[PDB]
Each structure stands twice: as structure tokens, then as C-alpha cells.
Design a binder for this molecule. Sequence first.
Ligand SMILES: Nc1ncnc2c1ncn2[C@@H]1O[C@H](COP(=O)(O)OP(=O)(O)O)[C@@H](O)[C@H]1O
Ligand SMILES: Nc1ncnc2c1ncn2[C@@H]1O[C@H](COP(=O)(O)OP(=O)(O)O)[C@@H](O)[C@H]1O
Ligand SMILES: [Mg+2]
Ligand SMILES: [Mg+2]
Lengths: 366, 379
Amino acid sequence: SVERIYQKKTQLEHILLRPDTYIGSVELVTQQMWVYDEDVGINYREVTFVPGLYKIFDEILVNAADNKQRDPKMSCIRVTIDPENNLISIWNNGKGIPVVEHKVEKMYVPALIFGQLLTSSNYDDDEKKVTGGRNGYGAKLCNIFSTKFTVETASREYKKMFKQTWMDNMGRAGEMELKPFNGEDYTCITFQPDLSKFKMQSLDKDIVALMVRRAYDIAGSTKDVKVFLNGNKLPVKGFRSYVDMYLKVIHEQVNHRWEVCLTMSEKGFQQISFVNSIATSKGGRHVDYVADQIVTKLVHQVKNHMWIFVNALIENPTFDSQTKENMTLQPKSFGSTCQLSEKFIKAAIGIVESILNWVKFKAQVQ
Amino acid sequence: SVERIYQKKTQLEHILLRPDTYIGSVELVTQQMWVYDEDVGINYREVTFVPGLYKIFDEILVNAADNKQRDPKMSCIRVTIDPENNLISIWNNGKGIPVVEHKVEKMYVPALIFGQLLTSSNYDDDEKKVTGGRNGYGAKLCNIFSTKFTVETASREYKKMFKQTWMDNMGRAGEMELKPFNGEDYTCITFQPDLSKFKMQSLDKDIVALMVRRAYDIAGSTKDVKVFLNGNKLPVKGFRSYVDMYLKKVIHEQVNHRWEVCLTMSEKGFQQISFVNSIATSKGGRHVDYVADQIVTKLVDVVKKKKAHQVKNHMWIFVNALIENPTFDSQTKENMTLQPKSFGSTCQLSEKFIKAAIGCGIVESILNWVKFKAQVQLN
Ligand SMILES: Nc1ncnc2c1ncn2[C@@H]1O[C@H](COP(=O)(O)OP(=O)(O)O)[C@@H](O)[C@H]1O
Ligand SMILES: Nc1ncnc2c1ncn2[C@@H]1O[C@H](COP(=O)(O)OP(=O)(O)O)[C@@H](O)[C@H]1O
Ligand SMILES: [Mg+2]
Ligand SMILES: [Mg+2]
């Protein structure tokens, strides 16, 4: 009884036993947000989906983007969503993953970082990196919440092609398959989400609408990277064009680590931001960093008329929940500063309207 | 090379290397909240503190209160906060922890659940409990983030007392000293927060005011439990007297063994103060929505006779609830996200409660105000 009452759990068991701790809610939620609907495009609706499922997807997408930092020659990302076969696949070019056995861990690097918990190349904070990768859980959580998870990576360097498959929530893997290789390097993660774990019948419209919009986010938050979806290249060419989709407008590429866009808001303070290609959908201090700067410059009263669009690269970011929707790192510990051109600060005044304040010269009488 | 680049961290290493993920922010934050200041009492001011620090304290406090759902006979919780010595201790009576060796982990239970990760007596969902604990990290996290963590529990049932100290972020631990016992069993854990991991120099005024308010929260949210703060007994007997601190017209009702509600008129927009299994749900959750909405409706009703989200904005509601396997969206359990369908119980206010609700300074203010706005011209 003492043994049945006081239990010790393995890590894998705990993740499956307490999902919401690692990937967020595995229950349905309903809330308004920007999605990209088939035939209608990017719009702001009400949506019902499981955050846990959107997350394991986001994890593999960001890893794809992250590879851009690791290798600048990366040119594009190819996303594939197929509801009927319940298949998702993310592909990226750029330096593949070293297909060689890891001397300390005693196993091939790919099998190590996609099949073992707490494995990562972002564990050394002296590197001060601007990747979304950080905790080393991501790819594994997706693997842990898939019925089938496949990893295929190719590195010219070690001149080999690695391919392996996991099944039943990473509870069993297939036989590692290696082949000689010599070509352009690529990596492709193909997974079948364990929809049972999320109490879903299939990849419905909403969740698909969310994911598709994320591919657009990537296409807009990364640099010199082309994003493909189901075979068609998305029409995003930088942040500005991306921001455009919402406005169909003061802009500025402060530097290599920033880019901001402002515009009026008839619906209170509106913000849309990204940190290392992560969709910080609730906010963060990186967004409050620019806002409060722009605001004060021309002065809460004014902020509420703003629709800010921020896209930054931050060193070793720090977030709230597992849904990483609200960043917190201190503006001091950013790795760079964001200051507007005299121009911007100027071409940003054409929001000012003491008109409502002036017109406030009404009189209340019986 | 490859070995230096791709690393595998250990569970303990990982927690220290990535705090925010287990205990929330390890940085200072500034927000408005109720706290209990020395000599002033409960007040709403601005506060600057580290969530992670508050969390490790809250994990041991809630653990003490969780024991009440384990031994209904528990009757007291004693809390000690010694800034000067950077020491905190939380004492509780009632059934102590089984001082015996765990046959599968081949080590004593106290040592197992306070020193090994992923250990809990709440991994059995079926059991259907209303404790704050559910993930088996809490205690280990207070330990991992303390320079010294001492665990002492006495158990009459096993005729023994246990006592062991851990040190340097659960990196090392002294020897386990056992002794005979047969008195009233109790559990007390003492720890010294590794302030440096929090960028702190000491337990300042702010963080202590918050830790002290939690002590009062426990007094107000646990059933028949006297609470002591540094040897002195907090003057709180049950939820109603707890709610009274916040006030210098109030509606009350203990719906059932798992729900207690207090309602008053608010002048600063919707207001809520609540608890789920003694956890401070500062940002609300489905449980507050469930009680509030049910009240707003009966009020909107008397509105038609003579405004909707407008009604909810005149309300100051207090909710103490016991929920089964509660869920939170954050590293702070400030917002309880479970659906009412899975609560494990219901909470339909009494016909006698709504009646009284219709009479407090509420409708007479909406109607008074609707009237006001009608007889107004804009010149
Ligand atoms: N598309 C990709 N290309 C190259 N390496 C990748 C890719 N996706 C993941 N990785 C590697 O796998 C690890 C990522 O696993 P993950 O669970 O997401 O942890 P994190 O992103 O926090 O580092 C890193 O060590 C990274 O180098
Ligand atoms: N004060 C206490 N009295 C009795 N048992 C306790 C106490 N504190 C902790 N425990 C035991 O230790 C475990 C709690 O560890 P914790 O890390 O807080 O996990 P949990 O999520 O279960 O609360 C449980 O198995 C519980 O029975
Ligand atoms: Mg990752
Ligand atoms: Mg606990």
C-alpha cells in the first residue's frame, strides 16, 4: 500500500500523465485569434482548438526556422499538412544534422536529440543565441504526442543519410537506417499526431487554419527564407509584406535584430509580435519596449490608439507558460536596443488627434 | 565538437538551467495585489517580487493544507518567516508521513518524496482528490532552490520520527537520523531560499508581505485550521472572517462542503478573490466565472423588469472552492482553467442567497445610473 500510494514516475510517464505541464491544455478552448482561412485568407475569427496540438506543431516549425541561425545559407522551409492521412511534415534545407555517433551518449546524434528527453544544442548560455530553441523538450514532445514520428536528415559532411521512426508516443522506435550521402543537406520531420490524446476526430478546419497562419508567420518573421505549403510558395517577402496581409502604416527595420510597424487602432491597443520566430500572441516585454518608447515620445491614453507590429531577435529569451505566448526577458538583457529613426518618430505622427480631447468641450445638462 | 554542441542534461541540472519553466519567473516583477503589511494589515498596493521565490514558498504551504484532505483531523498550521536568518519553516499536524522504507525505491518515504523528482501520492487520478498537489515537483522544487532544506516528520502509526537535511540546491544531503516516537505526529519543513538564484539580497518587505498574506489565506480557506505566524495565532476563523479583513453590505453562503461565496458591491469594476484547493487563484478561472455568471443572470433579470456585462462590473465576489484535479494555464496557478463539468461537484446558490443579492447596493445603482444617463442632454 505504501508502495501503491507513494509513486515515482519516469519522465516519459509524467509527460503523458500530466500533458498540460509540458505542452499546455489538451482540452478544447474557444477564443478569437488570427487564422488563415482557405478561400478567405488571413482573418480574425473565433476558433475552437486544442493548444497542446497546435504546440507540438509549432515546436517542429520553429526548429526549422532555428536552423537558419545555425546556417545562413538556408533558403527555404516546406510545410505539408494532410488531414485525410493525418500527416504533417516540415522540411528545411541548410546544414543537416551530424549523422555520426555521439561519443558521450553512445548513439547517433539524430536519434539522441529527437528520441531522448532533455537533449539540445542550446544549453550553453555563453553562446548568446537568438534561436527559439532553449529547453530541449520540443521535438520530443511532438514525438511523445504522435502515433508515428519520423526523422530524416542528411549531412554532406559526414556523408550519410539518417532516417528513423518512433511509434506509440515514443514508446518504441524502428531500426535506424543509414545510407551514404552526397548532396544538398536537408531535414524532414514527418509525424502523425496522436489525435486520441487530444480527443479529436481529425485535423479540422480551425486547427488547420491556425497552422497555416503559422507558416505565414514564419515566412514573415525569418529572413531570406522561402516558405512552401502543400506545394505552393506563400506570398510573403519579409515582415512588411507580411504585416500588409493584416492591413489589406509607419514602418522601420531598426536593424538586423528588429523591425517595427505602427498604425492606428479603433479597437484599443493592438499588438502582433514574434520573438525568434515564436508567436508571442499575448505580448512580451519586447513589444512593451517599443510601444512605451513610441508612446511616451508622443505624450496609456495614447497607447490605446496603437496597432504595433514587432518582430525581434532576442538572446536567450524567457517566456511565461509552456505556450510561450508572453515573453519576459528584461530589455536590459536583450543583446541589442531598438531606437527609432528621427524619421519614424516623425512619420509616426500621421495618430495624433487632440480632436477627441478638444471635442471633449461638451457640456452635460439635464 | 559534436559532444560539446549537442548535450543531454540531467533532470536536476535542467531545472537549475531553466527555472522559468518549473517555478515561473526568476526575475523581479511589479504589479498591484493584496498583501498583508506589518501594522497595516491587508491592503492593495504595488509590489515588486520574484514569482519563482513566491512559488517555492507556496508549494510547502499548500502541501501543509493538502494534508487536511488526507487527515480531516489536522487542526493547525504554523508558519515561520525569519528574514534576518533567511529561514522559513512550515509546521502542520495531523497524520505525518509514513516513516518506513519504500520497498520499490529502497529508501525512506520522507526522503523519497522530498528528495527525488517526480514523486507523489497524487498520481492516482481515479482516487479523485481535491489537493493542490498533482504533479510531484513542488517539494523538490523548494529543495532545488534552497541552500538548505530540512525535512522532519513524526509518525505515531510507524512509531518513528524522521529528520534529514539537504543542501546546495538538493546537490548534497546529510545523514538520515531516525528515532522512536508515539506522540501526536506532525510534519515541519525548514528551508533557506537560495536568494542568489533570484537576484535577491534578502527577504524584503514586499515578498514578506505576500508570504504573510498567504498565511492569512490558508486561515481563511482551510476548514477548522488554526494558523500561526511566528508563534502568534492569526485572528481568522473561516472564510467569512477572512473576507471581513478586505472590508472595514455583504452577502454570504456556504453552498456545500466544497463551496463558499461572499458577495459585495464593487466601485472599481468587477473584483474577485478566490481559492481552489487553497491555491490563490489571483486571476480567477472557470470556478469564479461559474459562480459570478450565475449571479449576474438573476440580476440582469431584475434589470429587464425595471445591461449585462455591466452587472458583473458592480460585483465584488469571493470564492473558496474544492475542485478535483484542477488545471491552471500558468506557472503560478493564478487562473484555474478546468471546466465546470469536471469540477466534481456543483454550486447552485440558494434561492435565499440570490434574493439577498438583489437587495445589496447593486441593482439600485444600475437602475439609478440608467436613469441618470437618460435625463441628460449633450450641449
Ligand atoms: N530542422 C532542424 N535542423 C537541424 N537541427 C535541428 C532541427 N530541428 C531540431 N534540431 C536539433 O535538435 C535539438 C532540438 O530539439 P528541441 O526538442 O526542439 O530542443 P530545443 O529547440 O529547445 O533545442 C537541437 O539540439 C537542434 O540542433
Ligand atoms: N506536509 C505534508 N504532510 C504530509 N505529506 C506531505 C506533506 N508535504 C508533502 N507530502 C507528501 O509528499 C508528496 C508531495 O510532494 P510535492 O512535490 O508537493 O508533490 P504533489 O504535487 O503531490 O503535492 C505527496 O506524495 C505528499 O503525500
Ligand atoms: Mg525546439
Ligand atoms: Mg505539493
